Amino acid sequence: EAQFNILSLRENKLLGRKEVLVEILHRKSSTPTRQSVREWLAKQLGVEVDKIFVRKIKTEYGIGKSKAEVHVYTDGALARVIEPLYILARNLGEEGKKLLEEARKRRNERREKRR
Amino acid sequence: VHLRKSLAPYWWPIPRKAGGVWAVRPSTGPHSLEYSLPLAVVVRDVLRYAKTLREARYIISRGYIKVDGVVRKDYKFPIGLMDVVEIVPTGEIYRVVPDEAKYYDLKPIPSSEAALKPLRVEGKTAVSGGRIQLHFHDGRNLILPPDVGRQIKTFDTVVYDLENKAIKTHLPLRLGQLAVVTHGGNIGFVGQFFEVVWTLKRRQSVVALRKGEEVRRTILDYIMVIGTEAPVVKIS
Amino acid sequence: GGLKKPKKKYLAGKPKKIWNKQLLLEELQLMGEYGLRNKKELWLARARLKWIVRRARALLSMTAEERAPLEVPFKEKLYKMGFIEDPNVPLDRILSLDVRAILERRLQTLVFRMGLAKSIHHARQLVVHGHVLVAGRRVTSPGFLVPRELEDKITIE
RNA sequence: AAACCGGUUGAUCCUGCCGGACCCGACCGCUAUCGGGGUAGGGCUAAGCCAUGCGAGUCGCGCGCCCGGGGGCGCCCGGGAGCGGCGCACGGCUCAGUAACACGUGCCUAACCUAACCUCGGGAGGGGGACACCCCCGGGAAACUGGGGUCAAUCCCCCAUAGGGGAAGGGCGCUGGAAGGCCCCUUCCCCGAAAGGGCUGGCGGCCGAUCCGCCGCCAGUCGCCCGAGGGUGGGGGCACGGCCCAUCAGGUAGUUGGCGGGUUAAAGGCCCGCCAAGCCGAAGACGGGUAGGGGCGGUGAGAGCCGCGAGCCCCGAGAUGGGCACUGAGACAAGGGCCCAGGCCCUACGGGGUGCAGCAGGCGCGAAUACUCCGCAAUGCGGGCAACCGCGACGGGGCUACCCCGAGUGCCGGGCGAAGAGCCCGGCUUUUGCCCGGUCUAAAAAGCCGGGAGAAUAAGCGGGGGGCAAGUCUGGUGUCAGCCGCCGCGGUAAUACCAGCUCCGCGAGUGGUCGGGGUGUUUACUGGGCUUAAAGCGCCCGUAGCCGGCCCGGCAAGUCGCUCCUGAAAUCCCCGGGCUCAA
Ligand SMILES: [Mg+2]
Ligand SMILES: [Mg+2]
Ligand SMILES: [Mg+2]
Ligand SMILES: [Mg+2]
Ligand SMILES: [Mg+2]
Ligand SMILES: [Mg+2]
Ligand SMILES: [Mg+2]
Ligand SMILES: [Mg+2]
Ligand SMILES: [Mg+2]
Ligand SMILES: [Mg+2]
Ligand SMILES: [Mg+2]
Ligand SMILES: [Mg+2]
Ligand SMILES: [Mg+2]
Ligand SMILES: [Mg+2]
Ligand SMILES: [Mg+2]
Ligand SMILES: [Mg+2]
Ligand SMILES: [Mg+2]
Ligand SMILES: [Mg+2]
Ligand SMILES: [Mg+2]
Ligand SMILES: [Mg+2]
Ligand SMILES: [Mg+2]
Ligand SMILES: [Mg+2]
Ligand SMILES: [Mg+2]
Ligand SMILES: [Mg+2]
Ligand SMILES: [Mg+2]
Ligand SMILES: [Mg+2]
Ligand SMILES: [Mg+2]
Ligand SMILES: [Mg+2]
Ligand SMILES: [Mg+2]
Ligand SMILES: [Mg+2]
Ligand SMILES: [Mg+2]
């Protein structure tokens, strides 16, 4: 159904994060939710879900296997300053949506000014 | 200024087709444009610490990377032959040494060795006060008194202390010393300087290095003496 | 001033005089035997065969010293693909290869020859609809050239 | 696959031309379900004309002011109009000019400049000024713009020193292949730096809530000035290489050279004063024609031929035609300036603006053509300490028979049918199409995973006399209508026209016309021919060119072998790997 495993885990001390690559095996089943991948990784690593960010879940052709690229951060402030706004919007839920909306408002401003 | 990816140097460790149409252009610093790699390219494609130019520029702007004893916060800083690269939060120290396969590679070196740089003398000039300015292979200069400047010739090597701004040792270009090819085709070969044909132009003289029975030839401009039978600094 | 664009890969297999009755008969026989969609598939197989044969001719024309670092890997690759059965045959025997050897390596042909389908067209339908698994993954291209190591890893759903 | 076939004869062997068959590019007709990969699309047509929108900003850690919230120490946060720095000379377009040091390869500048960045050595002292925004008034249709007041600077200027240049003389010394160069000494003349500015923390002092600063020191940090080298960009020079025509044979007069100067960052008839007659040309001047050059592309078994030498990358030139300048390190500057020409738009008649060869878009021309769409998430660049900001570059989709790749338009058994098509019967499957979820995406779309019903939603184009695969089957017409790349049919019994039936070739393609290659040993180096088929000048002398006896000795230029520096990347061939294989 959904067999998850830590395929690999690199540690980038420069960005203060760990980049985990996870293997997901789901035969005859849909692609796993990125929320489910984050919950499994949080439970596996003993960390809060907010500290874990998914970059991309790519599913093979012709088989229910998916590889997920996940970032785990030592603190939420550096996580939100490093990860892209669309990534935070995908992962954090509503706070990423709020960040994207505020960015869009601040871009509409100064464009009206440039007009 | 822009650098089209087609006009990027061929030895650079980047794909030639898959990617954008631009490449990070080195910012006119202490090397040659075609014999150096920008710091962002080193961070993103050589060490794989950053996944994008934004992340690489963040890492560089924090001051985590040190080149030749000085923190470099410019993402376009050129990195070239024999440069010491130091990562601060991790403690890892590399030397940019000539390589047979990648043509230029970051090889880890000891912390005691990290403060020394073997610089090939590229020329001498007479400057004010009667002093001698030595110009090295990466554009660095050193002003010395005339008596010490008299006995150092072009194509010699000096092991130079970055922290003291002094010449730790001088390795003159003599037959039988150990030399490394720092340029074209026969790059990275280490061997004994055992044969020379002195052309009229000294820079274009034909030099032959030997590694047991392995004989390679280059021009005199393309070799650097790294000492006698044992190299002074870890290059391999 | 010229910009490179891709060219058809089956041109080397396609004949220049299509209106020969003998050539039409043999091509029709091959097409009906292996259940090919159109003449383009047969000509692609012939182009593959022509590449193999001309590689053999070129390696024969090179000297012994030049041929030495290429002769053994070439036959090894042909054996691994399944076009040649003995990887240690002489090089000039490779010159006499036949397009039926290449046509046997099609996934539809292998599905029919393993008895997984009632007919070659039913094997093509199986591969198209996705009921053929190659080592666990669905391979939906009937024209896929299965290698020797992957030949035994063919299953049905 | 290193290929032939049809045609001139009553028949035969030749010559030799034309056609057929293949690939590629452009346009066009009929038809067209899906997906993937890719740097396809007003080039081949007027560098023809344009409505509209967008297309270079960034910096408060350079500077003063104003506004709003907060708080007491010395300000914190946010915003505004600006001055000021840096950038806008990169990036984007297109192909008129150009047969040229434009371009390519190989070398130079010892004849030169270069902001930003790197390194080494040294320096940062004294003093002064103005102009914005703003306030009080405006003027003008608009564009734009006037007067007074007033606060600043990394804004502007002077002074000092450092330093720099010119002339001349001398020298151990440096570089370098070689000094007209560098350094040292000597003399005079001349020019002539700097922002210790910002921030952080600490210390001390002056000062006041009408202040929230100013000053002196220290450390850190980003900065400023001089000298030298590098880096980058640029200017300039050299050798060689790549079109047609003689129904173009003489051309040139600052033209060729020398000498002395001016200008330039720098050499040069670059320009100027004098002096000489030189310079180019049949090894093709000059003249005309065509054309941006290269990487490269199509075709052929190859030599070769062609340019589809449009798209992609590098160099060049241009911004309606022709000129000339400002600023600046850099322009004589596509979305900056000035003038002539030639258009056009607004106006309040006094004035102002404007030329899409930028991304969309409109008209025109033509055989011939895309959305007035989305994002700065990737690739980079300018600015910034940074965070970040901007970018019609770039990225993404749209449209379009752009090129390549993979598939569908069912499978199985039975019957009728002919063994065919098709129909019916029984079973199977769901690629595909349709609906839903996850994933994916900057967000979408698509893709992938999974779920639902269902045979169900999906084949055309050309042809059947020979070449050349496919009908002497049927009807109609009757040298008419029509076919016909060539040979040839049709004038009553048409296998060739018009239709039916049927078969053939390729197939999401299949045809028409063009251009290139093959064809073609019809351009012949490989490799043709000249008695009669086209082709020996009516004959001879001879210049350039090409071709040239034997032996010995020297060289090593051609030649051959090895090696090095190179011939950007992409493209091409081989090998390994990763996309489901494939591309
Ligand atoms: Mg006859
Ligand atoms: Mg045009
Ligand atoms: Mg600052
Ligand atoms: Mg402001
Ligand atoms: Mg440009
Ligand atoms: Mg200044
Ligand atoms: Mg001087
Ligand atoms: Mg002064
Ligand atoms: Mg001042
Ligand atoms: Mg002069
Ligand atoms: Mg002249
Ligand atoms: Mg041929
Ligand atoms: Mg274009
Ligand atoms: Mg003009
Ligand atoms: Mg202009
Ligand atoms: Mg125009
Ligand atoms: Mg346009
Ligand atoms: Mg971006
Ligand atoms: Mg296809
Ligand atoms: Mg029957
Ligand atoms: Mg979707
Ligand atoms: Mg038809
Ligand atoms: Mg008929
Ligand atoms: Mg026939
Ligand atoms: Mg006919
Ligand atoms: Mg002939
Ligand atoms: Mg005759
Ligand atoms: Mg005669
Ligand atoms: Mg005559
Ligand atoms: Mg006569
Ligand atoms: Mg020779």
Side-chain angles (χ1 to χ4, degrees):
Chain A
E1 195 34 49
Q3 306 328 104
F4 315 76
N5 80 33
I6 304 264
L7 184 36
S8 63
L9 183 145
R10 223 283 305 291
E11 322 105 286
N12 194 347
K13 305 184 224 51
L14 286 172
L15 300 170
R17 77 205 185 166
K18 71 177 72 230
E19 305 144 349
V20 317
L21 152 67
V22 310
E23 180 43 277
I24 312 159
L25 250 170
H26 46 90
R27 279 65 37 93
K28 280 310 273 141
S29 46
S30 35
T31 315
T33 309
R34 84 175 61 107
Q35 207 42 30
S36 324
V37 198
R38 280 170 22 112
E39 303 317 346
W40 168 103
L41 194 60
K43 153 231 299 186
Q44 163 100 14
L45 297 185
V47 317
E48 145 83 35
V49 201
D50 174 46
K51 330 298 322 302
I52 288 204
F53 297 91
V54 175
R55 276 255 161 164
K56 182 211 207 255
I57 294 173
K58 163 51 203 164
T59 313
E60 292 199 357
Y61 182 83
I63 183 135
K65 232 199 294 205
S66 318
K67 266 86 142 53
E69 163 185 354
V70 185
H71 285 152
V72 187
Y73 281 90
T74 315
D75 53 45
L78 181 66
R80 282 163 189 67
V81 88
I82 293 197
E83 285 298 337
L85 281 201
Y86 76 99
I87 279 317
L88 301 180
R90 271 189 207 174
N91 284 180
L92 294 172
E94 86 299 352
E95 36 192 33
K97 297 300 220 105
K98 286 178 171 243
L99 304 198
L100 268 181
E101 86 91 29
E102 303 151 310
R104 179 45 95 171
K105 306 284 220 103
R106 308 175 275 159
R107 203 154 261 135
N108 280 348
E109 328 305 312
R110 315 170 328 228
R111 161 132 42 205
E112 192 270 329
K113 215 182 101 141
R114 183 149 328 287
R115 185 268 344 162
Chain B
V1 266
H2 282 79
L3 183 71
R4 183 85 51 179
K5 225 161 67 143
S6 78
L7 279 175
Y10 184 49
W11 65 266
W12 279 13
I14 58 175
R16 287 263 142 194
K17 269 191 157 179
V21 303
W22 303 113
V24 181
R25 164 151 193 143
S27 65
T28 199
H31 266 293
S32 266
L33 161 59
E34 91 298 354
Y35 297 145
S36 61
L37 199 82
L39 195 59
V41 168
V42 163
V43 174
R44 195 183 54 198
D45 328 74
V46 170
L47 305 168
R48 289 252 211 200
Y49 278 119
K51 294 193 171 171
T52 64
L53 191 67
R54 299 236 200 155
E55 290 177 5
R57 271 168 98 203
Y58 175 84
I59 291 167
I60 282 164
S61 285
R62 306 272 74 68
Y64 288 143
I65 331 279
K66 211 197 270 181
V67 193
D68 276 324
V70 186
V71 170
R72 299 293 168 209
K73 291 195 165 184
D74 172 34
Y75 76 104
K76 304 211 265 175
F77 195 86
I79 309 288
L81 180 82
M82 302 258 156
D83 287 325
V84 176
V85 192
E86 181 155 284
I87 294 185
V88 183
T90 306
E92 36 174 334
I93 306 176
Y94 305 87
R95 206 183 264 294
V96 175
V97 302
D99 178 31
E100 298 47 19
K102 310 138 92 161
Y103 179 91
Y104 263 12
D105 54 1
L106 285 171
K107 290 279 132 294
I109 62 167
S111 280
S112 70
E113 160 140 329
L116 295 176
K117 198 178 172 170
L119 302 161
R120 162 162 135 144
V121 179
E122 226 44 34
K124 300 189 304 199
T125 207
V127 297
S128 303
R131 300 170 299 177
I132 295 275
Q133 200 178 28
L134 283 132
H135 325 295
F136 297 120
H137 73 269
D138 62 343
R140 192 164 316 239
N141 290 302
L142 172 69
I143 292 188
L144 294 177
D147 82 359
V148 307
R150 166 159 337 282
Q151 42 99 345
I152 295 183
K153 286 301 177 333
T154 290
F155 307 108
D156 288 5
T157 307
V158 320
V159 183
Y160 155 86
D161 192 314
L162 302 161
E163 325 328 335
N164 267 359
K165 322 222 287 195
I167 284 176
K168 188 219 64 93
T169 184
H170 161 236
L171 283 47
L173 211 188
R174 257 178 308 92
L175 264 171
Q177 317 266 287
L178 208 70
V180 67
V181 196
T182 67
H183 278 108
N186 291 331
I187 188 131
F189 180 82
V190 188
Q192 212 212 357
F193 188 30
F194 81 107
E195 220 272 325
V196 70
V197 170
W198 290 113
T199 47
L200 173 58
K201 211 116 176 98
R202 299 247 307 152
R203 164 156 288 173
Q204 285 291 309
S205 324
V206 193
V207 313
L209 309 194
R210 187 174 42 197
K211 194 197 317 260
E213 337 228 322
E214 242 272 347
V215 180
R216 321 276 266 261
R217 250 155 287 262
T218 326
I219 36 168
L220 170 57
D221 196 8
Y222 277 2
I223 72 165
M224 156 166 62
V225 173
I226 55 165
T228 307
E229 86 298 345
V232 42
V233 319
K234 168 200 214 230
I235 297 192
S236 176
Chain C
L3 167 77
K4 187 84 195 26
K5 318 166 200 173
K7 305 296 166 207
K8 291 164 209 162
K9 332 283 181 220
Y10 65 97
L11 283 199
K14 184 172 147 297
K16 292 197 182 181
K17 273 213 129 181
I18 265 76
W19 297 333
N20 185 13
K21 183 163 256 77
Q22 208 48 68
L23 160 69
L24 280 154
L25 195 68
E26 273 70 330
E27 288 202 346
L28 169 52
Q29 177 286 23
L30 274 170
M31 197 95 40
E33 289 195 337
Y34 295 105
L36 310 162
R37 179 178 141 121
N38 36 75
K39 300 283 223 198
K40 239 181 296 179
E41 290 174 352
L42 178 59
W43 300 334
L44 184 58
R46 219 206 298 278
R48 188 34 157 272
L49 157 64
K50 295 291 204 20
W51 189 94
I52 294 162
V53 180
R54 282 169 214 161
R55 187 68 174 133
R57 262 176 248 163
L59 290 161
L60 274 165
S61 151
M62 326 189 329
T63 97
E65 195 144 5
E66 326 306 300
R67 194 193 297 96
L70 301 148
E71 194 192 40
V72 186
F74 174 58
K75 288 187 282 207
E76 289 311 20
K77 176 153 178 166
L78 297 158
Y79 175 66
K80 285 239 215 310
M81 266 321 317
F83 307 138
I84 71 108
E85 328 91 5
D86 183 357
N88 323 114
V89 280
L91 200 57
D92 48 88
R93 340 289 308 300
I94 279 69
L95 297 170
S96 321
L97 217 81
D98 189 284
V99 71
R100 284 203 183 66
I102 288 177
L103 297 178
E104 296 293 353
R105 305 315 302 182
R106 282 176 52 96
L107 178 56
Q108 157 189 12
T109 299
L110 290 172
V111 170
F112 185 43
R113 295 248 181 293
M114 290 156 108
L116 273 33
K118 305 187 193 168
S119 85
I120 198 96
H121 297 294
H122 178 65
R124 173 163 198 127
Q125 219 238 209
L126 286 174
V127 185
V128 167
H129 285 252
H131 309 299
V132 169
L133 298 173
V134 168
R137 186 199 318 283
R138 278 177 329 231
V139 157
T140 40
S141 201
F144 168 55
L145 277 274
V146 189
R148 210 178 292 260
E149 316 304 273
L150 287 193
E151 214 219 332
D152 59 337
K153 318 163 137 92
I154 304 173
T155 326
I156 276 275
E157 70 192 275

